[PDB]
Write a protein that binds this ligand. Structure first.
Ligand code: SAM
Length: 234
């Protein structure tokens, strides 16, 4: 009858009072990220974010959360990608990701840019989000492989991709998961994540403790560069 909290397996959650229909609808609903501190507070309808403003979960009393809005005017809303549209605001960064990772030249030779941690964190920490356009496995497997550098399977029916133009931070920085390079001794894994803005996607989660400024890597789990590194690793 009072405040309800719906946690997702990934650690994120929706919190607020449910209307007479038992649905997350109102101007005071919020999505709280896995750090249980960063939140998007505002207008939600049936659990879907219409207008969320960056805020901080200051504390909770008997399940009732106390939020404090962060200075600024950036607004966020459910903006699930389509087969051709990656985002309504490609240059609006995700606030949780912004405080945890950054892009820089990779430490891996001839590997282009990489993703690095901004902070020291422990095992199982969500660090970045892998958002992108949604296409079928047939389109990916049928088309020229040279176009599958940023493809990541989401589930049995969808593959996420960050198409050429958008692989440049100057054109797209809403999420940065596609910047993590491959390693056979990775410190992260791709994991399912229910994002309030991106919807069902995958995230980059640490497998263990990582230090500030350490490069984040994941095992792609499969190109020539990969074969070369595999032989070297072996
Ligand atoms: C998902 S992107 C990761 C970010 C990319 N390095 C960039 O600058 O945008 C995949 C591409 O990065 C490179 N990449 C990833 N792991 C690599 C590795 N271990 N060695 C060399 N190149 C790598 C290649 O072009 C590859 O297809």
């Amino acid at each position: 009858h009072g405040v309800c909290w719906i946690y997702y397996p990934d650690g994120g959650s929706l919190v607020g009072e449910v209307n007479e229909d038992g649905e997350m609808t109102g101007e005071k609903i919020a999505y709280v990220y896995p750090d249980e501190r960063t939140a998007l507070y505002g207008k939600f309808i049936d659990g879907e974010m219409i207008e969320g403003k960056l805020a901080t979960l200051m504390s909770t009393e008997e399940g009732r959360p106390h939020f404090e809005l962060m200075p600024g005017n950036s607004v966020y809303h459910f903006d699930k990608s389509t087969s051709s549209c990656i985002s309504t605001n490609a240059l609006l960064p995700d606030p949780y990701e912004s405080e945890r990772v950054y892009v820089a030249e990779s430490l891996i030779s001839s590997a282009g840019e990489g993703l690095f941690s901004k902070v020291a964190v422990g095992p199982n920490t969500v660090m970045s989000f892998y958002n992108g356009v949604r296409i079928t496995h047939q389109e990916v497997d049928s088309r020229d492989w040279a176009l599958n550098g940023n493809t990541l399977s989401l589930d049995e029916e969808t593959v996420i991709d960050v198409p050429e133009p958008y692989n440049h931070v100057s054109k797209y920085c809403a999420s940065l998961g596609h910047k993590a390079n491959h390693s056979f001794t990775p410190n992260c894994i791709y994991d399912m994540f229910v994002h309030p803005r991106f919807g069902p996607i995958k995230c980059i989660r640490t497998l263990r403790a990582v230090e500030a400024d350490e490069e984040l890597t994941v095992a792609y789990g499969y190109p020539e560069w990969y074969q070369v590194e595999l032989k070297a690793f072996q």
